[PDB]
Design a protein around this ligand. Structure first.
Ligand code: I2N
Ligand code: I2N
Lengths: 302, 302
C-alpha cells in the first residue's frame, strides 16, 4: 500500500532523446525510426520569437543546417518538412532503440509522464496532467523544449506531448506529435491568455477512492446526493461538471471499495463546503486532481 | 520554471531488474556484473515469515533452487551466499547492461528514486526520502520486494535502497545493498516500532528557497531570528534540530536568492506558529520536507 505520484519508467523514451541544433539554438528532439521530431522554433533566433514567419525562416534553411546528435553518434539529415508547429527531419539512420510507439492526442484531465531533457540528455521524470485549459503545471527551464510526455501500455509508448514554451504566468504549453498545440496557443513569445483553470472533478473522486483504499476514511460521511445537486455545488466551486461517463469510469473503484459514486460525491460536496479542518488525505491538505481513475487502479493493482 | 517532485531517469536501472523465484516465492532482483542481489526472505514460505531461521532455511537450498529470469533470458546460478539480509547469487553471465554503479548507505533526510517493480518488470518511478526514523513513505504492493532506490551522478548509479517489507502502520522498510536494514528493523513479520517521525527541517528550508525562486514570496516576513531561538521553536513542533552544517548546505540557495538563511528560518518559525491561513506554497498547503538542498539546485539549474 501507500500512494504516490508515479511516473512510467523512462528507459524506452530515454533512447530516443537526441540533441538538435540549428544555427545557435539547441533543443531536444525525439528520434523514432528514421525521423527526428522537434519544435519548429529551433529555426529562430531570440529576435525572431516575437513575430516569426516560420515559412520564410525555414526557406533559408538547408538539410546541412540541422545538427542532430545522439550521445556522440551523429546523424545525417536527408529531409526536412514542417508539420504545423514541428520539424520532421528525415535522417539516414533508423533508431536501433525505437520502441513500439504511437502518436496520440490526449484529452484534458488525462495524465502522462514528462521526461525533462536538456541538450538531448535526460535529466528527470515526473507525472503531470493536461489541465482543463490545456496547459500543464510542469518543471521546465530554457532548453527543455522538445521534451516529451508519454504513457506506456505494456510495451507501447504513446507519445502525447512535446514541450514548446512557458507562458508569462509560469505554466507550460506544447503540442501533440503532429504539431497541433493543445489549447488556443501559438509559438510566438507574446501575452497569451489561458482560460479559467477548473478542477478535474472525476480525478478528485478517483483520488478519494485511492484514499479509502489506503486507510484514510475520516471523510466518509452519512449523506448522499444527486448528480445534479452535486453538479450545482461543483460549478459553485469551479469544478468540472460530472457526467454519467465519469460515474461509469469510476465504477470499478466504487465496486472494489463498496462505496457508491454518489456517496463519494456527497463526501466531496461536504469537503468543498467545509474544507478539511486541518486534517489530511493521503498526506495532502488539498484536494488532488492529477490522478485519473486508471492511474489509481494501476497503482493499487500493480 | 515550475517545481515538481522529480525522479531520476530509470533506464540505467531498468536493465538490471530481474525476476527471482525460489520454491513458490517470486520477487525482484538487481543483476550487476555476474551477481544478482535480492532480499533473503525469498527463501521463506508464508508460514516461515513469523520467526524464520535464515541459516537453517538457506541450508536446505541449492544453486538449482534459485530461478533467475531476465525478460525471457535466464541465468544459471553458480554461487549463493547470505550477506546480512540479502542473497548474493553468483550467475555465469555478466549483465551486458551493467551501468557504472556504487553501493552507498544514505543518511536520514537524503532522497532517492525508487523503481517499483513486480516480477522483475518495472512498473513505475518516484522520488522519496529516508525519513528520520529510517522508514520511507512509498507505494509498494506485495511482490514489490527487491525494488531498489538510487541516485544518479552523471553516469554513475548509486544504489542505496532495497525494499523488504511493509510495517503494519503502512510505511516501508528495507536495506542498503549490503543487507543492513536502515533503522532498528528485522525481516520477520512482527509488530515493529518505528520512532517518532520528525520533520526534516533543512529540506523544508530548501523547499521555501525553491518557492521564492519560482515566484511564491507571500511568506517572506520582516523578522529575523537566532539559530538557537529557531531550534527552540523547531523542537516545539517536532522538527529536526538545525545545525551550522545545515546552514552551510543552504548557503548556495541563500546566495542565489539573496535571502539570509536565518531570515528564512524566521519565515518558517512564523509559518509553524501561525499556519498558512489557507494560502499555498508551490501548490501545497503543507510544509514539504522531501526536497534536499541539492534536489532544489538540480531542479532549478538543469
Ligand atoms: O518559452 C519559451 C521556451 C521555454 C520553455 N519552457 C521553459 C522555459 C523557461 C525559461 C525560458 C524559456 C522556456 N520561449 C519563449 C516563448 C516562445 C514561444 F514560442 C511562445 C511563447 Cl508564449 C514564449 C522561447 C522559445 C524559443 C526561444 C529561442 C529560439 N531560438 C533562440 N531562442 C526562446 C524562447
Ligand atoms: O511486508 C512484507 C512484504 C511487503 C512489502 N511491501 C509491501 C507489501 C504490501 C503488501 C504485502 C506485503 C508487502 N512481508 C511481511 C513482512 C515481512 C518481513 F520480512 C517483515 C515484516 Cl515486519 C513483514 C512479507 C515478506 C515476505 C513474504 C513471503 C515470502 N515468501 C512468501 N511470502 C510475505 C510477506
Amino acid at each position: 500500500s501507500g500512494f504516490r505520484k508515479m511516473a512510467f519508467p523512462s528507459g524506452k523514451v530515454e533512447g530516443c532523446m537526441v540533441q538538435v541544433t540549428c544555427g545557435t539554438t539547441t533543443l531536444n528532439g525525439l528520434w523514432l525510426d528514421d525521423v527526428v521530431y522537434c519544435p519548429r522554433h529551433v529555426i529562430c533566433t531570440s529576435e525572431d520569437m516575437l513575430n516569426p514567419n516560420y515559412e520564410d525562416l525555414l526557406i533559408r534553411k538547408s538539410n546541412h543546417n540541422f545538427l542532430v546528435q545522439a550521445g556522440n553518434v551523429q546523424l545525417r539529415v536527408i529531409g526536412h518538412s514542417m508539420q504545423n508547429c514541428v520539424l520532421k527531419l528525415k535522417v539516414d539512420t533508423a533508431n536501433p532503440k525505437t520502441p513500439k510507439y504511437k502518436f496520440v492526442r490526449i484529452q484534458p484531465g488525462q495524465t502522462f509522464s514528462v521526461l525533462a531533457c536538456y541538450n538531448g540528455s535526460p535529466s528527470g521524470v515526473y507525472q503531470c496532467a493536461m489541465r482543463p485549459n490545456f496547459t500543464i503545471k510542469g518543471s521546465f527551464l530554457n532548453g527543455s523544449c522538445g521534451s516529451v510526455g508519454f504513457n506506456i501500455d505494456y510495451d507501447c509508448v504513446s507519445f502525447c506531448y512535446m514541450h514548446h514554451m512557458e507562458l508569462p504566468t509560469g505554466v507550460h504549453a506544447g503540442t501533440d506529435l503532429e504539431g497541433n498545440f493543445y489549447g488556443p496557443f501559438v509559438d510566438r513569445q507574446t501575452a497569451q491568455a489561458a482560460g479559467t483553470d477548473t478542477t478535474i472533478t472525476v480525478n478528485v473522486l478517483a483520488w478519494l477512492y485511492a484514499a479509502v483504499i489506503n486507510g484514510d476514511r475520516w471523510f466518509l460521511n452519512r449523506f448522499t446526493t444527486t448528480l445534479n445537486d452535486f453538479n450545482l455545488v461543483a460549478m459553485k466551486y469551479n469544478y468540472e461538471p460530472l457526467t454519467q461517463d465519469h460515474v461509469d469510469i469510476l465504477g470499478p473503484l466504487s465496486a472494489q471499495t463498496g462505496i457508491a459514486v454518489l456517496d463519494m460525491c456527497a463526501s466531496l460536496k461536504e469537503l468543498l463546503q467545509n474544507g478539511m479542518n486541518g486534517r489530511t488525505i493521503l498526506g495532502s491538505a488539498l484536494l488532488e486532481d492529477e490522478f485519473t481513475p486508471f492511474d489509481v487502479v494501476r497503482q493499487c493493482s500493480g
